[PDB]
Amino acid sequence: LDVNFFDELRIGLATAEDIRQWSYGEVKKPETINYRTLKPEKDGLFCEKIFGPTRDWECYCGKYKRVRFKGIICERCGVEVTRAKVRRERMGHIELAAPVTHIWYFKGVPSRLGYLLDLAPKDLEKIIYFAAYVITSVDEEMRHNELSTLEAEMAVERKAVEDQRDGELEARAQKLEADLAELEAEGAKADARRKVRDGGEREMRQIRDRAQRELDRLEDIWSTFTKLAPKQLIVDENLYRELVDRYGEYFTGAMGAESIQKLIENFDIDAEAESLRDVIRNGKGQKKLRALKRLKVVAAFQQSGNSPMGMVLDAVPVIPPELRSDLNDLYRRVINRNNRLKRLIDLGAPEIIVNNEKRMLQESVDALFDNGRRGRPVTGPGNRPLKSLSDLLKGKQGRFRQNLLGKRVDYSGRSVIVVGPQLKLHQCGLPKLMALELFKPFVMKRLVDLNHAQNIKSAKRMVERQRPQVWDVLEEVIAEHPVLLNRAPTLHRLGIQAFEPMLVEGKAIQLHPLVCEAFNADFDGDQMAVHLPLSAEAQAEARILMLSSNNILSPASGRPLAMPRLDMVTGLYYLTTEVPGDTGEYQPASGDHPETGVYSSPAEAIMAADRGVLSVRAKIKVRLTQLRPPVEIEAELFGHSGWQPGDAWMAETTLGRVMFNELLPLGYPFVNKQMHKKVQAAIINDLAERYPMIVVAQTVDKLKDAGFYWATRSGVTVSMADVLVPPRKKEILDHYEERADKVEKQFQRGALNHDERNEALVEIWKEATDEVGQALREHYPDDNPIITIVDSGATGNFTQTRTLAGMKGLVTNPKGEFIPRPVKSSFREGLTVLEYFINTHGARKGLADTALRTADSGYLTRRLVDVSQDVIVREHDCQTERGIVVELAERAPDGTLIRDPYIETSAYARTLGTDAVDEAGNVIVERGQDLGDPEIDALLAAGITQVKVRSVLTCATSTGVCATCYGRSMATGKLVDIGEAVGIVAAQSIGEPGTQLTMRDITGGLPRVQELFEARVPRGKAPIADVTGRVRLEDGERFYKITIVPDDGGEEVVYDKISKRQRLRVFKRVLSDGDHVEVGQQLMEGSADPHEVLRVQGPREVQIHLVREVQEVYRAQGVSIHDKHIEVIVRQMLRRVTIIDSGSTEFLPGSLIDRAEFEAENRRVVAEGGEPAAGRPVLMGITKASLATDSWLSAASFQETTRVLTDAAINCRSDKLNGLKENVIIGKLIPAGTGINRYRNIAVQPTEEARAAA
DNA sequence: AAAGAGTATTGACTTAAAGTCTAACCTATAGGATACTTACGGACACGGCGAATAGCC
RNA sequence: AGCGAGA
DNA sequence: GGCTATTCGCCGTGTCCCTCTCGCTGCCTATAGGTTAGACTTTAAGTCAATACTCTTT
Ligand SMILES: [Mg+2]
Ligand SMILES: [Zn+2]
Ligand SMILES: [Zn+2]
């Protein structure tokens, strides 16, 4: 059977010997099962004598029927009596009467047979489908001697044909003499005599033409010989049969697959490989390019021990009888045609019939291995293609991406989800029936242990009728058993989290609200699947790694994802905001009474608020004795070691803020700020950074509770009366309609064309839009429900508010342009019919655009994951000096350090490569620090901008990356572990903001991202500066010519065809003709292809370019992704070098070889004679990088299955099963996280003191 | 010390099963001779190939 | 195999 | 003067197109051999039942 001894997996061409070695028999009849008794036939497609017994442990006839007869073969029927399941294991084989060629190596462009034999594809096809003869052997020296003899014999034949030729000419002459005698002897017409005479000499012209035909037929054949050599096709078999009958010897010409077999027999690989290598080394140009193409496959066969006989097949293997009859029918066709061929050869048949039958057999094998590849697919009942033996493997519905990496699983459930706010963050409701069913084994065990049932089957009966006693035991068993909750699609790592389940009454998984965002799961009919870990390892993994309370911060940007939002944030905003002039406010008036605003303790404040005296949102002064004061008050009152739990201090704030601040931990200082969602996020981020995660969970949960309660009390409701239109709307409408009418009049006088007036109206109405928006904003009070919800950060944006009251605005044309009408009505006021009809365009287009974009995003994520499927941490530190530089703050022209806007995703969570230096002073922060917020603050304060940080790009470790160079784990909040699969995390983080990554020709959306990671030359390829020099732009419409005089160098280069419509990117000032340029300044407007920038500026500059561009496109929509994930991908992109000089070491020119292996070869060859094989770095798309891996089982799982398997087979490639996809497919443990060889084999034992306790 | 039950004998009766033989009834194969002798989306990418010009035979 | 539908 | 090679264009074929879930319909005749199936005649295995003696329990 099989064990863990799978260290290496090998694929290769299977020779006929191997095929008949695998087979346990030889099916030779097209009979599946008897129509009447319904049993397999002898020697059929389901023969029990071959593939085993249908029902286990008896032969066909039944002489032996029990287990003790194990491994015995019954003499009567020959069935080996054993287990029945072996029918899924044993193979047959069909011994083809004539050879056939495997399709994959024939039709898959480039035709590997064609390249191996150097036969043109059309030619080869005509050979192997019996349409044109091919020679396979020829003669040499005796060829010379009989060529002289044959020169004499063709002199004889030419003389004979010329003799008949002149005899025909003389017969013409005599018939012409008779004709002229008739013409000029009898009385005939003046022209009729010349009619017959012209006709006669016309007959002679055709006779001389026939002569020329005979000449041709002889000398052309002689010329065919005089330069004859094999592998030479001959169409028009008439010439072939002529040659054979005249030249039966001196060549052997064949037709079909066996012809190719013979061609491969008389084919020495070493001589052809040497000749091709010589041609490449000395010959240049297109000829070299083809010769290189063939050398690929020719070397593939040379280096490996597999001979090219495997391409032509003598026997076809028979898949075991589980396929069970679409595919089976194809097999029947093959067997029918093979048997008929055998009979035809036996009886003795004309060449035509047997040749046609051979062609039919070839076509049948073709259809079997791949139906529809060549010619129309073989169709079945209902006129549909038969699912060929290869269609099982390819596509979405192929075996690789429906059944191997993705499987359906037992012990799982699914239900709709309903918000439950009463649950703790680490809990999830689970309906009683679903839990009972899922846990039916465990509850059975417990109720048999409890003696509620006598035995297992009685217990199973007990549960199947849900007897009343089986609920208490159920509560006992479910306790302390984690469960995973997935919500498809799992866009990112936080799509699946482990909760502790709890029973709930009715049929609905009660989810915790705070994790809603993590799932993006919103309660209107989403269905969340539930999975149940079983093994001790799985339960530990779920309880520890996956627990919902253990994953608060996003793995992408680390911002808290359990943060309160929507309702809770609104409640907190209402609680912590301050309303001057409210009841119970503070007033310091004296001379008549005290301030009457202060309170002894917060408890006093709540007791007053219970009375209708103190509002929760009034300014007051409370003597706090249990909340830590802010930094300044602590530093003033206590200064050094203020022990707050007993100390008291006077706080001038609102009671609501006090009630809030009690929810934070004891150590957190008093905040005293209005709780915008932003401020909440900052608070939670700081809390997670400082305090342990469990505290973060508890605080977040308390926050949710308070938020919901106070949102209920917040008094936020929507009514028409609460939606206040702006009173100045009509005046603005008139004011801007006046300009619109003016533009209409100017157009009606021909002042401007349609496009110009469309743009003018667009501008006028957009201005009107902004004006009414401003009027509405300033018209609203602050306490309004709508402004309250929007401005608190709870949800929605002011554009929606403005559309709700005021004016919706310009509506998109279904092409994408702007309707110049535009809509002038608020939804509150109610849109008119035509305004609504115009509006529908935009919404329908948006909905449509969502679908295609999510499809493309999913595909992109698949690509990125595959490329990064093997980027996992391996070492703590490589100590590599190399690093990248990040700018941080930029010097102000007046002199000042303004923090760079995009610092939170660039330098945060990075390890310093070199010690910081200040004014050539001491080190503020030395090498090897996480560079968390205080560090960057210190650097900014001291006055340093550029800092050298370590990154994955400049990581010295060959395998994966090291912990330090990668930097901080964004999710865990500390340094990375030695098993984290940072590659998968990176890719998923890039892909997650898909769809929400929208757009508004050079691309700028998800297509632009794809292009950046695909290395595709952009459409708007703006030229870039190459060498510093004064520019001499010339004027060419669509073909700007651009000269640049090199500062030092060679020759200025002019760019023949560059688009004029672009706008020159500004330089040190707008870039203009006559200006000295840089080595990288973008000349024109638009992007630049990354290959060019690489070739100009080395690997570092192209790296920085790619990261900057992708980050830009993402930032353009406001999604924050840390730079490091991108760095990981671009690192994966730059790992291969192109070979210019082969040196003398097995490196074909143009080969894409890994840099680590490149260096290894170099250190191998420096000794024993040095031949440095020069190479240059190169940038290759994500797809190519993935498909260039050293693992065929992963590349095959990825895409374009047929080609990758054919290539790997020809190379006899062996997969070492080191990646993640592979380990998934074969079902052994991934080498990542808890699977690597340092954790996978930990030894655990008690202590000697513990043994003493025993 | 007595009685009842179990562990044996033996014969007597009984029924499944099973090994021949039949028979008859399906079942698989071959053959049929006046003369006729031709069907019925769209984008990316690479590799197999138009149009040109110059040099060499 | 084909239809329709939810997220 | 013509053909081929080194240089461009041009066109054709192949590959890909997110995930998860729910319900419903689609001529004839002649030979020879197998074939089990079906009944007859054996068994072989099973069931009943008389009898009696010995051992254990009350
Ligand atoms: Mg929803
Ligand atoms: Zn048998
Ligand atoms: Zn490193």
Curated annotation (Swiss-Prot):
This is DNA-directed RNA polymerase subunit beta'. The gene is rpoC. Its EC number is 2.7.7.6. It comes from the Bacteria. One of its GO terms (cellular component) is DNA-directed RNA polymerase complex. Its cofactor is Mg(2+); Zn(2+). It catalyses: RNA(n) + a ribonucleoside 5'-triphosphate = RNA(n+1) + diphosphate. Zn(2+) 1 binds at residues 59, 61, 74, 77. One of its GO terms (molecular function) is magnesium ion binding. Pfam families: RNA_pol_Rpb1_1 (PF04997), RNA_pol_Rpb1_2 (PF00623), RNA_pol_Rpb1_3 (PF04983), RNA_pol_Rpb1_4 (PF05000), RNA_pol_Rpb1_5 (PF04998). DNA-dependent RNA polymerase catalyzes the transcription of DNA into RNA using the four ribonucleoside triphosphates as substrates. It comes from Mycobacterium bovis (strain ATCC BAA-935 / AF2122/97). The RNAP catalytic core consists of 2 alpha, 1 beta, 1 beta' and 1 omega subunit. When a sigma factor is associated with the core the holoenzyme is formed, which can initiate transcription. It is an enzyme of class 2 (transferase). The keyword Repressor does not apply.
